[PDB]
Amino acid sequence: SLNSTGLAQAAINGLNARFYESSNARWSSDEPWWISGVALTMVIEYMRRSGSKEYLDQVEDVIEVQRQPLSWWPSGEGEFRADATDNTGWWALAMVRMYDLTGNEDYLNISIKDEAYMRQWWTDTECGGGLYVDIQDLTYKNAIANELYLKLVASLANRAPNATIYLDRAQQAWTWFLGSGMINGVNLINDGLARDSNTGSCYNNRLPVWTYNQGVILGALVELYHATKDESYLLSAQAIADAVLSPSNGLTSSSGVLTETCEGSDSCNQDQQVFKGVFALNLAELGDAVAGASSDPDAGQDYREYLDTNMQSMYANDRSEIVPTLFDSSTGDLYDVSWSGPFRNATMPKQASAIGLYVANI
Ligand SMILES: OC[C@H]1O[C@H](OC[C@H]2O[C@H](O)[C@@H](O)[C@@H](O)[C@@H]2O)[C@@H](O)[C@@H](O)[C@@H]1O
Ligand SMILES: OC[C@H]1O[C@H](O)[C@@H](O)[C@@H](O)[C@@H]1O
Ligand SMILES: OC[C@H]1O[C@H](O)[C@@H](O)[C@@H](O)[C@@H]1O
């Protein structure tokens, strides 16, 4: 059959052999720094779900160096506090997984510092809530930043000492998100909000439906369920997932393969190349929570069936292997952006998204 653990490791090896920079303790300095954080999450999640620890030394090197005050944002004072709330949020969630893997209070403390940094740009005076993404400009409360923050406070509500204040913040944050309008008529999440020129009220800006904006919210609702034992959160998550799996909504191909909207025009940029893996890994948390929340053995079978279907398509259609040489004995797998289309080339955001799908099936 298909050993997702073996292919995850081969993909991580391929990510490392092509894109990891030993001298910089980071993958691909020419790609968005926040995608290095996503990559770290995938490697941590692989280790956490497979029981292996083969990349734990490497992960710890990356943390120690990216922990330092950023050259492009020294006012953050390190600990991943960067020039945007979504930048910070990706690394914050990686530290939560780091904590889950190791149990070291140190990583949890980074997440606590990051929550407090992000909340600095939560304002109740515009849109009745939510935080801005552009720390320097304060012109956009989008979906990804508030989804990341929501999943952070919901995670802290399950792990941090003053867990109650985080439960209050997460419940208050989910209420704002739900009533914000970003969840549209088919239970998908548009990119962000826009503000009325004359009235100051906000509305769904009808910008694209990105796959990672339907994933991160699922993890937040799963964490909100673990902290409250309220299945209504799982039900809300399940509706967002169900809309994604529905081919009528354009996210799922006629072959049952997840497809970013830019894949058609072949115009997926550095950011959008990683979106799919973020959704898959989050849907795996939904499927796991759903299967355990009920005695039914078929609970979440469709989410697992979906991830499996997508894995075999990416394995057969999107895969390419590195050429070993007399000097470089490094082996592994490389992956392009389309989980059904051909393999043209591999980039770090595409590779990280491939790892996410394999880890989602581990
Ligand atoms: O490509 C769709 C997104 O494009 C814009 O943001 C790009 C990325 O910039 C940030 O630094 C990262 O943290 C990412 O989270 C973010 O996607 C925004 O318009 C965003 O809302 C779009 O979804
Ligand atoms: O993501 C890469 C990261 O490093 C660059 O040097 C800066 O311009 C940042 O604004 C950017 O976010
Ligand atoms: O339209 C919503 C939003 O779209 C853009 O991506 C942002 O740069 C903002 O200027 C604007 O408010």
Any ligand 2 atom below 6 A from CB of 134: no
Please classify residue 51 by burial: count the beta carbons closer than 10 Å to its beta carbon, then call 0-12 exposed, 13-18 middle and 19+ buried.
exposed
Ligand found nearest the CA of 204: 3
**Which residue's CA is minimally distant from atom 9 of ligand 2?**
72
**Which residue's CA is minimally distant from atom 7 of ligand 3?**
140
Nearest-angstrom CA–CA distance, 102 and 66: 18
Instruction: Copy the structure tokens of residue 235.
Output: 């039900």
Any ligand 2 atom below 6 A from CB of 33: yes
Nearest-angstrom CA–CA distance, 354 and 362: 13
Nearest-angstrom CA–CA distance, 216 and 149: 10
Give the Cβ contact number of residue 65 at 10 Å. Answer: 11
Q: Ligand 2 pocket check: which of 68, 83, 133, 273 to mutate, most ligand atoms within 8 Å of Cβ?
A: 83
- Partnered with residue 320 across adjacent β-strands are 334
Q: Ligand 3 pocket check: which of 133, 191, 204, 205 to mutate, most ligand atoms within 8 Å of Cβ?
A: 205
Ligand 1 centroid–CA 260 distance in Å is 14
Instruction: Copy the structure tokens of residue 191.
Output: 């990119």
Query: Alpha-carbon torsion 309, 252, 301, 278, what sign?
Result: positive
289, 226 in Cβ contact below 8 A?
A: yes
277, 46 in Cβ contact below 8 A?
A: no
Atom of ligand 1 nearest to the CA of 275: 17
Dihedral pair phi/psi, residue 47, rounded to 5°:
-60, -40
Ligand 1 centroid–CA 326 distance in Å is 41
Nearest-angstrom CA–CA distance, 133 and 213: 14
Which experimental technique did the depositors report for determining this structure?
X-ray
* End-to-end CA separation in angstroms for the chain: 13
Query: Alpha-carbon torsion 311, 317, 318, 319, what sign?
Result: positive
Ligand 2 centroid–CA 32 distance in Å is 6
Closest CA to 222 of 276, 169, 150: 150
Nearest-angstrom CA–CA distance, 38 and 360: 14
Any ligand 3 atom below 6 A from CB of 139: yes
Any ligand 1 atom below 6 A from CB of 31: no
Measured in residues, the chain has a length of 362
In units of Å, what resolution does this entry have?
2.5
Any ligand 3 atom below 6 A from CB of 138: no
Give the Cβ contact number of residue 286 at 10 Å. Answer: 22
Helix H, strand E, coil C: the string for the chain is CCCHHHHHHHHHHHHHHHHEECCCCEECCCCCHHHHHHHHHHHHHHHHHHCCCCCHHHHHHHHHHHCCCECCEHHHCCCCCCCEHHHHHHHHHHHHHHHHHHCCHHHHHHHHHHHHHHHHHECCCCCCCCECCECCCCCCCEHHHHHHHHHHHHHHHHHCCCHHHHHHHHHHHHHHHHHHCCECCCCCECCEEEECCCCCCEEECCCCCCHHHCCHHHHHHHHHHHHHCCHHHHHHHHHHHHHHHCHHHCCECCCCCECCCHHHHCCCCCCHHHHHHHHHHHHHHHHHHHHHCCCCCCCCHHHHHHHHHHHHHHHHHCEEECCCCCCCCCCCEEECCCCCCCCCCCCHHHHHHHHHHHHHCC
Residue with tokens 């005695």: 295
**Alpha carbon 56 to its chain's center:** 20
Instruction: Copy the structure tokens of residue 178.
Output: 């739900």
78, 70 in Cβ contact below 8 A?
A: yes
Ligand 1 centroid–CA 300 distance in Å is 30
Ligand 1 centroid–CA 322 distance in Å is 30
Ligand found nearest the CA of 32: 2
Any ligand 2 atom below 6 A from CB of 32: yes
Ligand 2 centroid–CA 271 distance in Å is 13
Ligand 2 centroid–CA 86 distance in Å is 13
144, 150 in Cβ contact below 8 A?
A: no
Atom of ligand 3 nearest to the CA of 192: 2
Instruction: Copy the structure tokens of residue 20.
Output: 């990891």
Which amino acid would we find at residue 275?
A: F
Any ligand 3 atom below 6 A from CB of 203: no
Atom of ligand 2 nearest to the CA of 32: 1
Nearest-angstrom CA–CA distance, 164 and 162: 6
Nearest-angstrom CA–CA distance, 34 and 42: 13
